[PDB]
Amino acid sequence: AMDMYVVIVYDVAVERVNRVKKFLRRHLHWVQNSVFEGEVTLAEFERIKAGLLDLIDEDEDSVVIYKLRSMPKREVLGM
Amino acid sequence: AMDMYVVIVYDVAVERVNRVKKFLRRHLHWVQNSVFEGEVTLAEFERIKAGLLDLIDEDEDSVVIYKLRSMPKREVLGM
């Protein structure tokens, strides 16, 4: 995590969700539907945040960016 | 985080997703569509995992359980 590690989850209306997905695929690892994660610099986090704000309707959509010190441990069920 | 703090994201087929949602609402905080988080004991994590395994089809569905030391910092866009 050069500066930090993020996990991003999003709940975006159907008219906008697939543009958010395509943008985040250019910056982070796709985990499953509407979940991305990866290491970022502080400047890259600012650019991700600014890109998301341009694509979402802030009265309708919700993006949660968890900010972590390094890649978190996880357990996968299924898959 | 009595023992640990979890963030759970899930990608479950339509026939099963709403039973997974209802189960996790009994154990964790609902963040947005298909995302839950909260503090758990080790025994409670085992019971959550066992409950999820009973409700999902492990050939189709995917649940990712991030295991964290405490409640993570996060930034919300929108909402």
Tab-separated table of all heavy atoms in Angstrom, chain B residues 17-57:
chain	number	residue	atom	x	y	z
B	17	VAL	N	-30.517	-14.507	-2.571
B	17	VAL	CA	-29.850	-13.314	-2.058
B	17	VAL	C	-30.618	-12.723	-0.883
B	17	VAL	O	-30.019	-12.293	0.112
B	17	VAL	CB	-29.631	-12.280	-3.181
B	17	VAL	CG1	-30.959	-11.766	-3.754
B	17	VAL	CG2	-28.763	-11.117	-2.663
B	18	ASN	N	-31.947	-12.730	-0.948
B	18	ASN	CA	-32.705	-12.054	0.090
B	18	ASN	C	-32.728	-12.838	1.402
B	18	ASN	O	-32.879	-12.225	2.463
B	18	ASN	CB	-34.110	-11.723	-0.441
B	18	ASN	CG	-34.086	-10.566	-1.464
B	18	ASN	OD1	-33.617	-9.464	-1.158
B	18	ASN	ND2	-34.558	-10.827	-2.684
B	19	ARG	N	-32.509	-14.157	1.373
B	19	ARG	CA	-32.308	-14.886	2.624
B	19	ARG	C	-30.938	-14.594	3.234
B	19	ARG	O	-30.801	-14.569	4.464
B	19	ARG	CB	-32.469	-16.389	2.400
B	19	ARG	CG	-33.891	-16.822	2.033
B	19	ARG	CD	-34.279	-18.100	2.762
B	19	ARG	NE	-34.265	-17.919	4.214
B	19	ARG	CZ	-35.309	-17.513	4.933
B	19	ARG	NH1	-36.466	-17.246	4.334
B	19	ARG	NH2	-35.199	-17.375	6.252
B	20	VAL	N	-29.919	-14.371	2.403
B	20	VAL	CA	-28.613	-13.962	2.929
B	20	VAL	C	-28.709	-12.587	3.582
B	20	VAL	O	-28.180	-12.363	4.680
B	20	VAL	CB	-27.554	-13.990	1.813
B	20	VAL	CG1	-26.278	-13.249	2.250
B	20	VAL	CG2	-27.226	-15.423	1.439
B	21	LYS	N	-29.378	-11.639	2.906
B	21	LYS	CA	-29.590	-10.311	3.474
B	21	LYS	C	-30.284	-10.391	4.833
B	21	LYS	O	-29.855	-9.757	5.805
B	21	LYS	CB	-30.410	-9.460	2.500
B	21	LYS	CG	-30.791	-8.081	3.039
B	21	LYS	CD	-31.606	-7.292	2.005
B	21	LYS	CE	-32.946	-7.960	1.718
B	21	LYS	NZ	-33.842	-7.114	0.859
B	22	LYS	N	-31.369	-11.168	4.920
B	22	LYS	CA	-32.121	-11.232	6.171
B	22	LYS	C	-31.288	-11.838	7.292
B	22	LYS	O	-31.362	-11.384	8.441
B	22	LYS	CB	-33.423	-12.026	5.971
B	22	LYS	CG	-34.406	-11.900	7.130
B	22	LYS	CD	-35.807	-12.400	6.738
B	22	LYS	CE	-35.814	-13.897	6.450
B	22	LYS	NZ	-35.417	-14.719	7.634
B	23	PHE	N	-30.472	-12.849	6.976
B	23	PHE	CA	-29.602	-13.452	7.986
B	23	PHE	C	-28.562	-12.454	8.481
B	23	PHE	O	-28.323	-12.336	9.690
B	23	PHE	CB	-28.921	-14.702	7.420
B	23	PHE	CG	-27.853	-15.286	8.322
B	23	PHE	CD1	-28.198	-16.036	9.435
B	23	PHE	CD2	-26.507	-15.099	8.040
B	23	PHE	CE1	-27.219	-16.579	10.264
B	23	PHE	CE2	-25.516	-15.625	8.863
B	23	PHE	CZ	-25.875	-16.377	9.977
B	24	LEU	N	-27.910	-11.738	7.562
B	24	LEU	CA	-26.845	-10.841	7.996
B	24	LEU	C	-27.394	-9.647	8.772
B	24	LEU	O	-26.698	-9.105	9.641
B	24	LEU	CB	-26.014	-10.388	6.792
B	24	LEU	CG	-25.085	-11.473	6.223
B	24	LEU	CD1	-24.372	-10.944	4.986
B	24	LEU	CD2	-24.059	-11.980	7.236
B	25	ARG	N	-28.640	-9.243	8.504
B	25	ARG	CA	-29.241	-8.157	9.275
B	25	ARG	C	-29.380	-8.527	10.743
B	25	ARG	O	-29.406	-7.644	11.607
B	25	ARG	CB	-30.609	-7.774	8.703
B	25	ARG	CG	-30.558	-7.010	7.399
B	25	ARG	CD	-31.941	-6.515	6.989
B	25	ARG	NE	-32.495	-5.538	7.926
B	25	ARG	CZ	-33.766	-5.142	7.924
B	25	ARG	NH1	-34.619	-5.648	7.043
B	25	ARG	NH2	-34.191	-4.248	8.809
B	26	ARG	N	-29.459	-9.819	11.048
B	26	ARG	CA	-29.510	-10.250	12.437
B	26	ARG	C	-28.146	-10.258	13.122
B	26	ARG	O	-28.075	-10.583	14.313
B	26	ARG	CB	-30.128	-11.645	12.524
B	26	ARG	CG	-31.534	-11.746	11.960
B	26	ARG	CD	-31.982	-13.197	11.903
B	26	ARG	NE	-33.321	-13.356	12.437
B	26	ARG	CZ	-34.410	-13.469	11.683
B	26	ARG	NH1	-34.307	-13.453	10.364
B	26	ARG	NH2	-35.609	-13.602	12.245
B	27	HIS	N	-27.064	-9.903	12.426
B	27	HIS	CA	-25.740	-10.071	13.008
B	27	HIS	C	-24.853	-8.849	12.813
B	27	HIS	O	-23.958	-8.603	13.627
B	27	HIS	CB	-25.062	-11.309	12.417
B	27	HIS	CG	-25.740	-12.593	12.782
B	27	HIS	ND1	-25.427	-13.300	13.923
B	27	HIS	CD2	-26.730	-13.286	12.169
B	27	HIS	CE1	-26.184	-14.382	13.990
B	27	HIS	NE2	-26.986	-14.396	12.941
B	28	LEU	N	-25.100	-8.076	11.756
B	28	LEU	CA	-24.204	-6.994	11.378
B	28	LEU	C	-24.997	-5.771	10.926
B	28	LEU	O	-26.201	-5.835	10.661
B	28	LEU	CB	-23.244	-7.447	10.266
B	28	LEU	CG	-22.249	-8.557	10.622
B	28	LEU	CD1	-21.507	-9.015	9.392
B	28	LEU	CD2	-21.263	-8.072	11.688
B	29	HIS	N	-24.288	-4.651	10.815
B	29	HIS	CA	-24.874	-3.406	10.338
B	29	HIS	C	-24.972	-3.415	8.814
B	29	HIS	O	-24.007	-3.745	8.121
B	29	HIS	CB	-24.031	-2.214	10.796
B	29	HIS	CG	-23.934	-2.063	12.281
B	29	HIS	ND1	-24.985	-1.622	13.059
B	29	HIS	CD2	-22.898	-2.267	13.128
B	29	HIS	CE1	-24.602	-1.573	14.323
B	29	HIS	NE2	-23.338	-1.956	14.392
B	30	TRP	N	-26.134	-3.046	8.291
B	30	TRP	CA	-26.329	-2.963	6.849
B	30	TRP	C	-25.779	-1.630	6.342
B	30	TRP	O	-26.212	-0.565	6.795
B	30	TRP	CB	-27.812	-3.114	6.517
B	30	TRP	CG	-28.122	-3.056	5.056
B	30	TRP	CD1	-28.116	-4.098	4.175
B	30	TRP	CD2	-28.499	-1.896	4.300
B	30	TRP	NE1	-28.464	-3.666	2.923
B	30	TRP	CE2	-28.704	-2.315	2.969
B	30	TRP	CE3	-28.681	-0.545	4.618
B	30	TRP	CZ2	-29.086	-1.432	1.956
B	30	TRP	CZ3	-29.061	0.334	3.609
B	30	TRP	CH2	-29.254	-0.115	2.297
B	31	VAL	N	-24.815	-1.684	5.422
B	31	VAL	CA	-24.146	-0.476	4.920
B	31	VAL	C	-24.821	0.042	3.660
B	31	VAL	O	-25.140	1.230	3.544
B	31	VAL	CB	-22.650	-0.768	4.662
B	31	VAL	CG1	-21.936	0.451	4.036
B	31	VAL	CG2	-21.957	-1.231	5.930
B	32	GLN	N	-25.044	-0.846	2.705
B	32	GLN	CA	-25.762	-0.556	1.468
B	32	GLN	C	-26.066	-1.908	0.843
B	32	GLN	O	-25.876	-2.951	1.480
B	32	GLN	CB	-24.957	0.349	0.535
B	32	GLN	CG	-23.531	-0.113	0.320
B	32	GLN	CD	-22.813	0.670	-0.770
B	32	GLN	OE1	-22.336	0.089	-1.748
B	32	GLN	NE2	-22.732	1.991	-0.607
B	33	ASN	N	-26.548	-1.900	-0.395
B	33	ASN	CA	-26.889	-3.157	-1.042
B	33	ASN	C	-25.704	-4.114	-1.017
B	33	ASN	O	-24.613	-3.784	-1.501
B	33	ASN	CB	-27.343	-2.917	-2.479
B	33	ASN	CG	-27.764	-4.191	-3.156
B	33	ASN	OD1	-27.029	-4.749	-3.973
B	33	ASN	ND2	-28.940	-4.692	-2.785
B	34	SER	N	-25.926	-5.270	-0.394
B	34	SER	CA	-24.998	-6.403	-0.376
B	34	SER	C	-23.707	-6.098	0.384
B	34	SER	O	-22.680	-6.738	0.152
B	34	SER	CB	-24.681	-6.885	-1.792
B	34	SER	OG	-25.878	-7.052	-2.525
B	35	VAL	N	-23.742	-5.151	1.317
B	35	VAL	CA	-22.585	-4.851	2.160
B	35	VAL	C	-23.030	-4.759	3.612
B	35	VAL	O	-23.974	-4.026	3.923
B	35	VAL	CB	-21.902	-3.536	1.753
B	35	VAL	CG1	-20.650	-3.300	2.625
B	35	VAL	CG2	-21.573	-3.539	0.255
B	36	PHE	N	-22.315	-5.455	4.496
B	36	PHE	CA	-22.543	-5.412	5.939
B	36	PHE	C	-21.217	-5.211	6.660
B	36	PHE	O	-20.147	-5.555	6.142
B	36	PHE	CB	-23.222	-6.703	6.466
B	36	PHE	CG	-24.673	-6.841	6.069
B	36	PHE	CD1	-25.021	-7.266	4.802
B	36	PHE	CD2	-25.685	-6.553	6.979
B	36	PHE	CE1	-26.366	-7.387	4.421
B	36	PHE	CE2	-27.038	-6.677	6.622
B	36	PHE	CZ	-27.376	-7.101	5.346
B	37	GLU	N	-21.277	-4.656	7.874
B	37	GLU	CA	-20.060	-4.553	8.677
B	37	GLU	C	-20.402	-4.543	10.166
B	37	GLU	O	-21.534	-4.251	10.559
B	37	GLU	CB	-19.232	-3.307	8.311
B	37	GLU	CG	-19.868	-1.970	8.661
B	37	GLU	CD	-18.942	-0.791	8.384
B	37	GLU	OE1	-18.076	-0.509	9.246
B	37	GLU	OE2	-19.082	-0.157	7.318
B	38	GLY	N	-19.403	-4.846	10.982
B	38	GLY	CA	-19.566	-4.774	12.427
B	38	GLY	C	-18.524	-5.567	13.184
B	38	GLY	O	-17.734	-6.332	12.627
B	39	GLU	N	-18.537	-5.370	14.502
B	39	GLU	CA	-17.632	-6.086	15.396
B	39	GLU	C	-18.180	-7.472	15.722
B	39	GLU	O	-19.391	-7.656	15.867
B	39	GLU	CB	-17.433	-5.297	16.692
B	39	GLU	CG	-18.729	-4.746	17.274
B	39	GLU	CD	-18.578	-4.265	18.713
B	39	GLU	OE1	-17.600	-3.540	19.001
B	39	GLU	OE2	-19.440	-4.616	19.551
B	40	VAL	N	-17.290	-8.456	15.832
B	40	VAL	CA	-17.703	-9.818	16.153
B	40	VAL	C	-16.696	-10.478	17.083
B	40	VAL	O	-15.504	-10.158	17.079
B	40	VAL	CB	-17.880	-10.708	14.895
B	40	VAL	CG1	-18.917	-10.138	13.930
B	40	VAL	CG2	-16.536	-10.952	14.207
B	41	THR	N	-17.182	-11.436	17.873
B	41	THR	CA	-16.290	-12.386	18.500
B	41	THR	C	-15.884	-13.452	17.487
B	41	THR	O	-16.492	-13.594	16.422
B	41	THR	CB	-16.968	-13.055	19.698
B	41	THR	OG1	-18.049	-13.861	19.218
B	41	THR	CG2	-17.527	-11.995	20.632
B	42	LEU	N	-14.830	-14.196	17.825
B	42	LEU	CA	-14.409	-15.309	16.980
B	42	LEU	C	-15.515	-16.345	16.841
B	42	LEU	O	-15.728	-16.891	15.754
B	42	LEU	CB	-13.150	-15.956	17.556
B	42	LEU	CG	-11.858	-15.743	16.772
B	42	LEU	CD1	-11.650	-14.280	16.508
B	42	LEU	CD2	-10.678	-16.333	17.530
B	43	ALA	N	-16.209	-16.648	17.945
B	43	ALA	CA	-17.305	-17.610	17.889
B	43	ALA	C	-18.456	-17.090	17.039
B	43	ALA	O	-19.091	-17.858	16.303
B	43	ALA	CB	-17.792	-17.938	19.300
B	44	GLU	N	-18.750	-15.789	17.140
B	44	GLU	CA	-19.820	-15.216	16.335
B	44	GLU	C	-19.434	-15.202	14.862
B	44	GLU	O	-20.276	-15.472	13.998
B	44	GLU	CB	-20.173	-13.813	16.843
B	44	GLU	CG	-21.093	-12.983	15.945
B	44	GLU	CD	-22.565	-13.328	16.096
B	44	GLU	OE1	-22.879	-14.358	16.731
B	44	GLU	OE2	-23.414	-12.561	15.580
B	45	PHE	N	-18.160	-14.928	14.552
B	45	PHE	CA	-17.724	-15.046	13.163
B	45	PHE	C	-17.928	-16.464	12.638
B	45	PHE	O	-18.380	-16.651	11.501
B	45	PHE	CB	-16.259	-14.637	12.992
B	45	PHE	CG	-15.692	-15.077	11.675
B	45	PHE	CD1	-16.068	-14.436	10.507
B	45	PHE	CD2	-14.852	-16.171	11.595
B	45	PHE	CE1	-15.583	-14.860	9.280
B	45	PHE	CE2	-14.366	-16.602	10.378
B	45	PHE	CZ	-14.735	-15.947	9.217
B	46	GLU	N	-17.616	-17.479	13.453
B	46	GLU	CA	-17.813	-18.857	13.008
B	46	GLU	C	-19.282	-19.142	12.738
B	46	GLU	O	-19.615	-19.879	11.803
B	46	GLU	CB	-17.269	-19.846	14.045
B	46	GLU	CG	-15.762	-19.842	14.169
B	46	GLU	CD	-15.061	-20.194	12.868
B	46	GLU	OE1	-15.579	-21.038	12.108
B	46	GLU	OE2	-13.984	-19.620	12.603
B	47	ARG	N	-20.173	-18.575	13.554
B	47	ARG	CA	-21.601	-18.797	13.369
B	47	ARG	C	-22.116	-18.053	12.145
B	47	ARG	O	-22.997	-18.552	11.432
B	47	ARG	CB	-22.365	-18.370	14.621
B	47	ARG	CG	-22.283	-19.389	15.753
B	47	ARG	CD	-23.286	-19.105	16.862
B	47	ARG	NE	-23.171	-17.754	17.416
B	47	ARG	CZ	-22.213	-17.378	18.258
B	47	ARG	NH1	-21.277	-18.243	18.611
B	47	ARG	NH2	-22.172	-16.139	18.735
B	48	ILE	N	-21.585	-16.854	11.893
B	48	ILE	CA	-21.952	-16.128	10.680
B	48	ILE	C	-21.511	-16.907	9.447
B	48	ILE	O	-22.274	-17.074	8.489
B	48	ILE	CB	-21.340	-14.719	10.689
B	48	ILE	CG1	-22.025	-13.846	11.743
B	48	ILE	CG2	-21.460	-14.077	9.279
B	48	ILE	CD1	-21.343	-12.486	11.953
B	49	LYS	N	-20.258	-17.362	9.447
B	49	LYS	CA	-19.756	-18.156	8.328
B	49	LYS	C	-20.603	-19.405	8.116
B	49	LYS	O	-20.975	-19.732	6.983
B	49	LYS	CB	-18.290	-18.521	8.566
B	49	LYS	CG	-17.732	-19.514	7.564
B	49	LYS	CD	-16.274	-19.816	7.848
B	49	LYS	CE	-15.797	-21.011	7.033
B	49	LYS	NZ	-14.364	-21.319	7.322
B	50	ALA	N	-20.934	-20.119	9.200
B	50	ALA	CA	-21.735	-21.334	9.059
B	50	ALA	C	-23.147	-21.025	8.567
B	50	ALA	O	-23.708	-21.780	7.761
B	50	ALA	CB	-21.782	-22.095	10.386
B	51	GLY	N	-23.744	-19.930	9.047
B	51	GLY	CA	-25.051	-19.537	8.542
B	51	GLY	C	-25.027	-19.216	7.061
B	51	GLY	O	-25.932	-19.605	6.313
B	52	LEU	N	-23.991	-18.502	6.611
B	52	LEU	CA	-23.888	-18.149	5.198
B	52	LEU	C	-23.699	-19.389	4.330
B	52	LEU	O	-24.311	-19.505	3.262
B	52	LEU	CB	-22.738	-17.155	4.992
B	52	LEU	CG	-23.030	-15.756	5.531
B	52	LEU	CD1	-21.755	-14.934	5.511
B	52	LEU	CD2	-24.138	-15.051	4.711
B	53	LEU	N	-22.865	-20.331	4.782
B	53	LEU	CA	-22.645	-21.555	4.015
B	53	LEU	C	-23.927	-22.362	3.856
B	53	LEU	O	-24.122	-23.019	2.829
B	53	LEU	CB	-21.557	-22.392	4.689
B	53	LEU	CG	-20.157	-21.776	4.598
B	53	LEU	CD1	-19.176	-22.455	5.552
B	53	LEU	CD2	-19.638	-21.842	3.162
B	54	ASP	N	-24.825	-22.301	4.840
B	54	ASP	CA	-26.096	-23.007	4.724
B	54	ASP	C	-27.033	-22.346	3.725
B	54	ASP	O	-27.904	-23.024	3.169
B	54	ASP	CB	-26.771	-23.104	6.092
B	54	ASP	CG	-26.194	-24.220	6.943
B	54	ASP	OD1	-25.969	-25.321	6.395
B	54	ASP	OD2	-25.951	-23.998	8.148
B	55	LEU	N	-26.867	-21.050	3.473
B	55	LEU	CA	-27.793	-20.315	2.623
B	55	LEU	C	-27.311	-20.147	1.188
B	55	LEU	O	-28.127	-19.842	0.314
B	55	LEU	CB	-28.058	-18.924	3.218
B	55	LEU	CG	-28.799	-18.897	4.550
B	55	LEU	CD1	-28.755	-17.506	5.133
B	55	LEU	CD2	-30.235	-19.337	4.350
B	56	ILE	N	-26.022	-20.310	0.914
B	56	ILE	CA	-25.507	-20.055	-0.416
B	56	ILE	C	-25.274	-21.369	-1.149
B	56	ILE	O	-25.207	-22.449	-0.556
B	56	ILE	CB	-24.215	-19.207	-0.385
B	56	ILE	CG1	-23.053	-19.992	0.240
B	56	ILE	CG2	-24.467	-17.906	0.361
B	56	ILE	CD1	-21.693	-19.321	0.085
B	57	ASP	N	-25.182	-21.264	-2.473
B	57	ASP	CA	-24.723	-22.335	-3.348
B	57	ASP	C	-23.259	-22.050	-3.653
B	57	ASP	O	-22.942	-21.095	-4.368
B	57	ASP	CB	-25.568	-22.378	-4.622
B	57	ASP	CG	-25.148	-23.478	-5.592
B	57	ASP	OD1	-23.952	-23.828	-5.673
B	57	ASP	OD2	-26.043	-23.986	-6.296
